[PDB]
């Protein structure tokens, strides 16, 4: 869905701006979802992320990295199944991959990482989200 691609572009633009990097991307039908995801991502990074293994140590993205290597690492998040906190961890992980790409003078990979996140989200997350209340459920549960 296009709305899911808008969530990815919004979250990544927000994370890049937090670190002082230029980005292209808060309105539309997904406005409340974008805001809740942005807040949940900040909350996850501040008090929850440190409790888990750093997934950026298992994935070193270069121009030769295939999407399947990204999927393999992301699959570690959803081992004991899918939940809203693991989805927030997924967005937070992609943001950190984009930040590292810009840090290592590989800004060209930012648009590829956004496409990979949208592919994983639509193929392996569009279905669980649909059957577990949709993004509307994430918004009233978080808010
Ligand atoms: C806190 C959490 C959860 C929750 C979240 C992740 C998770 N796990 C699953 C097993 C696993 C294995 C290996 C690595 C990781 C990982 O995340 N590594 C990462 N590295 C990096 C490096 C850079 C950037 C980002 C990241 S993420 C994880 C994460 N498991 C749970 C779980 O308990 O099932 C559910 N709920 N919540 C709480 C909460 C609280 C508040 C904020 C936010 C959203 C919502 C409202 C739920 C988290």
Swiss-Prot record:
Q: Which residues form a coiled coil?
A: none
Q: In which tissues is it expressed?
A: Bcl-X(S) is expressed at high levels in cells that undergo a high rate of turnover, such as developing lymphocytes. In contrast, Bcl-X(L) is found in tissues containing long-lived postmitotic cells, such as adult brain.
Report the residue ranges where the short sequence motif BH4 is annotated in this entry: 3-23
What does the PTM comment of the record read?
Proteolytically cleaved by caspases during apoptosis. The cleaved protein, lacking the BH4 motif, has pro-apoptotic activity. This phosphorylation is partial in normal mitotic cells, but complete in G2-arrested cells upon DNA-damage, thus promoting subsequent apoptosis probably by triggering caspases-mediated proteolysis. Phosphorylated by PLK3, leading to regulate the G2 checkpoint and progression to cytokinesis during mitosis.
Instruction: Indicate whether Lipid biosynthesis appears among the record's keywords.
Output: no
Q: Which GO terms describe its cellular component?
A: Bcl-2 family protein complex; centrosome; cytoplasm; cytosol; endoplasmic reticulum; mitochondrial inner membrane; mitochondrial matrix; mitochondrial outer membrane
Query: Motif range for BH2?
Result: 127-142
The motif BH1: which residues? 76-95
Quick one: effect of changing residue 103 to A? No effect on caspase-1 cleavage
What are the recorded GO MF terms, alphabetically?
A: BH3 domain binding; channel activity; identical protein binding; protein kinase binding
**What does the record list as GO biological process?**
apoptotic mitochondrial changes; apoptotic process in bone marrow cell; cellular response to alkaloid; cellular response to amino acid stimulus; cellular response to gamma radiation; defense response to virus; dendritic cell apoptotic process; dendritic cell proliferation
Entry keyword set? Apoptosis, Cytoplasm, Cytoplasmic vesicle, Cytoskeleton, Endocytosis, Membrane, Mitochondrion, Mitochondrion inner membrane, Mitochondrion outer membrane, Nucleus, Phosphoprotein, Synapse, Transmembrane, Transmembrane helix, Ubl conjugation
Motif location (BH3)? 33-47
Return the domain comment text from this UniProt entry.
The BH4 motif is required for anti-apoptotic activity. The BH1 and BH2 motifs are required for both heterodimerization with other Bcl-2 family members and for repression of cell death.
How would you summarize the oligomeric state and partners of this protein?
Homodimer. Interacts with BCL2L11. Interacts with BAD. Interacts with PGAM5. Interacts with HEBP2. Interacts with p53/TP53 and BBC3; interaction with BBC3 disrupts the interaction with p53/TP53. Interacts with ATP5F1A and ATP5F1B; the interactions mediate the association of isoform Bcl-X(L) with the mitochondrial membrane ATP synthase F(1)F(0) ATP synthase. Interacts with VDAC1. Interacts with BCL2L11 (via BH3). Interacts with RNF183. Interacts with GIMAP3/IAN4 and GIMAP5/IAN5.
Question: What protein family is recorded?
Answer: Belongs to the Bcl-2 family.
Described by its record, this protein's role is as follows: Potent inhibitor of cell death. Inhibits activation of caspases. Appears to regulate cell death by blocking the voltage-dependent anion channel (VDAC) by binding to it and preventing the release of the caspase activator, CYC1, from the mitochondrial membrane. Also acts as a regulator of G2 checkpoint and progression to cytokinesis during mitosis. Isoform Bcl-X(L) also regulates presynaptic plasticity, including neurotransmitter release and recovery, number of axonal mitochondria as well as size and number of synaptic vesicle clusters. During synaptic stimulation, increases ATP availability from mitochondria through regulation of mitochondrial membrane ATP synthase F(1)F(0) activity and regulates endocytic vesicle retrieval in hippocampal neurons through association with DMN1L and stimulation of its GTPase activity in synaptic vesicles.
Q: What is this protein called?
A: Bcl-2-like protein 1
Q: Tell me which species this is from.
A: Homo sapiens (Human)
User: Span of the full-length protein shown?
Assistant: 2 to 196 of 233
């Amino acid at each position: 869905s296009q709305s899911n691609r808008e969530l990815v572009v919004d979250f990544l633009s927000y994370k890049l701006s937090q670190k002082g990097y230029s980005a292209s991307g808060g309105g539309g039908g997904m406005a409340a979802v974008k805001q809740a995801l942005r807040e949940a991502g900040d909350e996850f990074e501040l008090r929850y992320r440190r409790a888990f293994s750093d997934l950026t140590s298992q994935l070193h993205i270069t121009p030769g990295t295939a999407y399947q290597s990204f999927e393999q690492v992301v699959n570690e998040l959803f081992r004991d199944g899918v939940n809203w906190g693991r989805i927030v961890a997924f967005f937070s992980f992609g943001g950190a991959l984009c930040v590292e790409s810009v840090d290592k003078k590989m800004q060209v990979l930012v648009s590829r990482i956004a496409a990979w996140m949208a592919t994983y989200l639509n193929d392996h997350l569009e279905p669980w989200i649909q059957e577990n209340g949709g993004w509307a459920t994430f918004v009233e549960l978080y808010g």
